[PDB]
Structure formats: structure tokens, C-alpha cells
């Protein structure tokens, strides 16, 4: 899912890479903890 509008509902994860063993989880539009979104966050990313 490439945009926030599609990133709704539920998808399947597959444990141990096995397509017989999967669980249901909600999908969520997530932001990286270190980003370059304003200048001040960008200095925090670059300090890391």
C-alpha cells in the first residue's frame, strides 16, 4: 500500500515465512523516527 488512503483495514503477516501460518494485523501509516521533514529533525537525524 503506497498512499495513506490505501493503508486501511487488515493484512496478513506470515510467521516463519510459511504461507500456511498467518495472522491478522491492522495496517497503519507510519513515519520514520528520524526524518528530514523540518530542519530541526534533520539535524537530529544527522547527529545520529
Amino acid at each position: 500500500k503506497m498512499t495513506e488512503e490505501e493503508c486501511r483495514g487488515y493484512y496478513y503477516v506470515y510467521k516463519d515465512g510459511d504461507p500456511t501460518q498467518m495472522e491478522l494485523r491492522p495496517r497503519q501509516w507510519i513515519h520514520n523516527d528520524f526524518h528530514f521533514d523540518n530542519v530541526l529533525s534533520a539535524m537530529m537525524s544527522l547527529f545520529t
Partner: protein, 50 residues
């Protein structure tokens, strides 16, 4: 979906009744690429698609 712990993975398109009236019968023929580059995560995926 989540009120028990078994979860349905039922799709209408997948259903046989849906399929016979979707389209006409067919002689298919699956080719599988088995060259060396495929070995890895990709080879694993093909066996599950076919």
C-alpha cells in the same frame, strides 16, 4: 474475522461457481522458470503461486 481465533480467508472471485460463469473452459500450461537466478526468495514464491 476476529471474534473467534479462526479467521476466514474467503474470496468470491476465488469460488468455483464464480469462476465457471466468469469465463469459458481453458487449456492452460504453466511454465516455470528454473534458472539459477530464481533460487532464493523468488523460487520460494513460485511454488506457492503455481
Amino acid at each position: 474475522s476476529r471474534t473467534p481465533n479462526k479467521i476466514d480467508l474467503y474470496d468470491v472471485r476465488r469460488r468455483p461457481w464464480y469462476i465457471q460463469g466468469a469465463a469459458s473452459p481453458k487449456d492452460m500450461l504453466i511454465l516455470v522458470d528454473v534458472s539459477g537466478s530464481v533460487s532464493g526468495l523468488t523460487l520460494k514464491l513460485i511454488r506457492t503461486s503455481v
